[PDB]
């Protein structure tokens, strides 16, 4: 995973863009204090639970759940944030989209999705709490707003509260990212009126056993072993070790 956190990587943080193109793997790695994590500030809803999703997923393919081109004709998507910089030119997350009002309107949208991928699929989004009512009107053309997300087992109602909050990355507003899983044959409906961060890259998942999440510091080279721990790997047939309790793979 390199520098970005799991929260950063699942959201396509613009610092591990290079992490996009690997979809099959063995076990996550994490620098203990990842800095370039969630670039736009906020509060990942149920962060730990989703962290536990990835502890056992074998492989997963990403796909444009709603392609940026044709999904939002009446809206505009090219919205960046100077905090979430990249090489100095302002940019946003890969997997998310900033549906801001276009041509002076922000028409109501209902961009549903009927899952037919025959596997559990993962979906992300967020609702942007501006720090200031004037921000809200200049960005979404409505005092209040509501967001609804619906499945055959999941539904909840989003009202983005307005409140000035302390400086976080020299930018006062915040989002809450959310997430959910869809069983095969389930349809998810995105009813919204204002303050959305629509999904662009939903993750089609495939679970398993034998993987895990660790937190190491050591570099990586061309070993060949079977039992890796935060302090390295083991290449012996002895049955007990005192290297570190947490293990990966079949281990003594």
């Amino acid at each position, epitope marked *: 995973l390199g520098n970005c956190s799991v929260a950063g990587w699942i959201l396509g943080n613009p610092e591990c863009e290079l992490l996009i193109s690997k979809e099959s793997w063995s076990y996550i790695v994490e620098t203990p204090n990842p800095e370039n994590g969630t670039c736009y500030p906020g509060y990942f809803a149920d962060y730990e639970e989703l962290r536990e999703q990835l502890s056992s997923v074998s492989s997963f393919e990403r796909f444009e759940i709603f392609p940026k081109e044709s999904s939002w004709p009446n809206h505009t998507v090219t*919205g*960046v*944030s*100077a*905090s979430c910089s990249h090489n100095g030119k*302002s940019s946003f997350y890969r997997n998310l989209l*900033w549906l801001t009002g276009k041509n*002076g*309107l922000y028409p109501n949208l209902s961009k549903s999705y009927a899952n037919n991928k025959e596997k559990e699929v993962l979906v992300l989004w967020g609702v942007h709490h501006p720090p*200031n*009512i*004037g*921000d809200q*009107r*200049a*960005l979404y*053309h*409505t*005092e209040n707003a509501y967001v609804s997300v619906v499945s055959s087992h999941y539904s909840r109602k989003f009202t983005p509260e307005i409140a000035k909050r302390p400086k976080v990355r020299d*930018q006062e*507003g915040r989002i809450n990212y959310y997430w959910t899983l869809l069983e095969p044959g389930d349809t998810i409906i995105f009813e919204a009126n204002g303050n959305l961060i629509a999904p662009r890259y939903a993750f089609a998942l495939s679970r398993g056993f034998g993987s895990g999440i660790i937190t190491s510091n050591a570099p990586m080279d061309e070993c060949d072993a079977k039992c890796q721990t935060p302090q390295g790997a083991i290449n012996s047939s002895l049955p007990f070790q005192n290297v570190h309790p947490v293990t990966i793979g079949e281990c003594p």
Partner: antibody
Amino acid sequence: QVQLQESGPGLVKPSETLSLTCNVSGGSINSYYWSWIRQPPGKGLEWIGYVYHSGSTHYNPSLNSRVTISVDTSKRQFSLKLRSVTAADTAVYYCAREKSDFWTVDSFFYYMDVWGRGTTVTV
Amino acid sequence: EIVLTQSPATLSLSPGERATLSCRASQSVATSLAWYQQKPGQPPRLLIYDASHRATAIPARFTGSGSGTDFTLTISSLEPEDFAVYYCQQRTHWPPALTFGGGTKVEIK
């Protein structure tokens, strides 16, 4: 293309109340910030105050509690209230659209304008 | 509270030369300043917004620049129809508080 025109010319006696309207062509009053602009002859331009397209008001503090603005609920016209009109503030009165564009999610520096032809409210 | 003191209060030049006008803020307004044009009698049209960009289909004549407190205008090349009065405009974001500056006239010699 939104094109705008004001209404309600004439005079006013001191301490009376000024009320002149402003109706919208081209598009409507649905979206943007709609603004009232006055300019004393041979001087600069102050700003009376303006109201959101939804109908939330913001008035110039230096000239408080003499003004009432809104859209006429036909959402095609809007008017200026001015109670106790002193013979001082004589001006050409401008109806101006103020629309906010942006680049990032921070600098909303874009506060564009398009306005009508000015109303000669001579006292 | 925020005010836009100006200088010079007037500039005169022979049509075809360089021109430069500036406005000074009473505080630190970052970049949300925009300047205008107003021919004798006619209502004004916006020219330069964010003190950075020309308006829609405005000739090569104009350019607004600077950042921070003092912003400056430049006329790389002028035309006699441009003899008019130019302004400046600040718009504080949340409490909208639009306030202009002086506004000066560009006559000739």
